[PDB]
Subunit: 146 residues, 2 copies
């Protein structure tokens, strides 16, 4: 079931992992351009959503406030999770926010094109990335309204 509290189009937020408490950033300098961070608020941690319509109904593009690039999640080449300019030109720029089966307050950031979810962990490298498989708690996220 879709997460029932998805921010309105244009509303700004951070994406913070439930368990690690790390946030996603999306920048233009110093690859990897998309990763996780444990520290103070910076603008490259700020996103809004582009609402999908038509074939993209119930999907969203995740767009950087400062640089305007949207996130992508793919399995075909490195980097697997990255950014690209536009408003969701490519199918792997589109995400579904799927409510957790157990914790109604969190969701997975799911990619239809690549059948992956994003994760954040403190354990094995790579500690941030995408994943196709069983549901684990390190795949759970919050919208943190700013």
């Amino acid at each position: 079931v879709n997460f029932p509290n998805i921010p309105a189009e244009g509303v700004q937020f951070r994406l913070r992992a439930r368990d690690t408490g790390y946030v996603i950033y999306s920048r233009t300098e110093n690859p990897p351009l998309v990763w996780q961070y444990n520290g103070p608020p910076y603008d490259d941690q700020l996103f809004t959503l582009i609402y999908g319509t038509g074939p993209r109904k119930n999907l969203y593009a995740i767009k950087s406030v400062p640089n305007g690039r949207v996130l992508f999640s793919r399995t075909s080449a490195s980097p697997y999770v990255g950014n690209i300019a536009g408003d969701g030109t490519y199918n792997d720029n589109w995400f579904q926010f799927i409510q957790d089966d157990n914790d109604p307050n969190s969701f997975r950031i799911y990619n239809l094109a690549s059948d992956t979810v994003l994760y954040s962990r403190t354990t094995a490298d790579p500690k941030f990335g995408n994943f196709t498989g069983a549901k684990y708690d390190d795949q759970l996220w919050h919208f943190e309204l700013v």
Copy 2:
């Protein structure tokens, strides 16, 4: 995770519920035109898949062999589950097959447009339909090869 053994494009199959053992049919006369059946093979139980591409990658239209109509699953009006002419003109004509978390051999028939899955039960009316909510075993299906 997408179901890993989805029939090749154009290959014919039935959809049988894991628990009830009932099959979906899709006909043109005598409503409800899409429902479940507990008996021997008839041609209206035969379907093929149109493979989605682009925005519909990992989605599929479910097309009836004898009558050519595709299935839809919606929450907006009755019938909630039905059929319609064409090859998937509308976003609610497209389905994802999502493998169960515990049983690798069954899946849910999921509609991205409507956030629903199809179900089959023997308990209360309506015994066949769609549903938005938690996961139950009566939502689990098999591809039956012919």
